[PDB]
Amino acid sequence: SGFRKMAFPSGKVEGCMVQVTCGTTTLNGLWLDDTVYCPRHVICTAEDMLNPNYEDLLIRKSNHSFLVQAGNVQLRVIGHSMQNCLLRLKVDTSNPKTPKYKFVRIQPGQTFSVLACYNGSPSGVYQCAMRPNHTIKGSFLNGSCGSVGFNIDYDCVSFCYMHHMELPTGVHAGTDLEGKFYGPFVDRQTAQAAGTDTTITLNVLAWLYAAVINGDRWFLNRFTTTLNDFNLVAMKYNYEPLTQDHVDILGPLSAQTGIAVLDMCAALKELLQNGMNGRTILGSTILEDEFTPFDVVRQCSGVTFQ
Ligand SMILES: CC(C)C[C@H](NC(=O)/C=C/c1ccccc1)C(=O)N[C@H](C=O)C[C@@H]1CCNC1=O
């Protein structure tokens, strides 16, 4: 029993974090096979960071403008290129600790683990949701750029995020591992506002199913609702519209609890309209939206506490 925001075990990723220095700027790089990936603003000085032209800044560097340190071992750069907002450094050594990996671009509402690192040395692990507005509510200080977000399937690491910047509201923005930003952000030392954000309705629902799987039914009711009538309430409460695909996705959790999706939607509509009346759900006083249906199936028992 229990339900916690749970990261993936970070060991396979720890073995790939390195430190990358260029001039005075130092940040983290990801070392896989014979390549180190890292944010391209490592080649920027304080002057450059406001309005940098990275094509121009980069051609002025050689391979030996870049210092790559893996633990104590210094790694020799033997090639470099720019891929969107990333730099690809080829090094003379292949990382023997490289795991089976893919690069994926996650979709809004999906979750991933973050391995926060400073000077190429892992520091902490936590679980994040890609918000609809393409930000993540991370925990990052100066020096954290190059930290990665990842999921782990069996023994394959799916890298999906590299950290680049912090927005004025304290949330974070970054790229996939091809250097393409999530959301409309750019790597420039300027304030850029997150778009307005929304609650992830599919995740709220998967988590109410987790509560029932773990044996708690107090919030259910006798009513039901149409998709459209639910979506009138969701829009009043700044919840994402529920679609027929999201209903379909909840099929397995609906099956395991015996609670039809639109019945659970009627439960959520009532929770939105009346509040929770000083009660908790899975230990929380608010409706949680950073667990996907995949997260719920992964963590809960396949046997409901009936
Ligand atoms: C050249 C750019 C892309 C670098 C990036 N710059 C920024 O994140 C600037 C953010 C900002 C906030 C308010 C007003 C104006 C700007 C950065 O510092 N990135 C840092 C990576 O090293 C991570 C920051 C540092 C503090 N917490 C973080 O997540």
Curated annotation (Swiss-Prot):
Superkingdom of this protein's organism: Viruses
Cytoplasmic side: 1-306
Cellular compartments annotated: Host cytoplasm; Host Golgi apparatus
Job description of the protein: Cleaves the C-terminus of replicase polyprotein at 11 sites. Recognizes substrates containing the core sequence [ILMVF]-Q-|-[SGACN]. Also able to bind an ADP-ribose-1''-phosphate (ADRP). May cleave host ATP6V1G1 thereby modifying host vacuoles intracellular pH.
Peptidase C30 domain mapped to chain residues: 1-306
The organism of origin for this protein: Severe acute respiratory syndrome coronavirus
Name of the featured protein: 3C-like proteinase nsp5
Catalytic site: 41, 145
Parent-record interval covered: 3241 to 3546 of 4382
Quaternary structure and interacting proteins, as annotated: Exists as monomer and homodimer. Only the homodimer shows catalytic activity.
Reactions catalysed according to its record: TSAVLQ-|-SGFRK-NH2 and SGVTFQ-|-GKFKK the two peptides corresponding to the two self-cleavage sites of the SARS 3C-like proteinase are the two most reactive peptide substrates. The enzyme exhibits a strong preference for substrates containing Gln at P1 position and Leu at P2 position
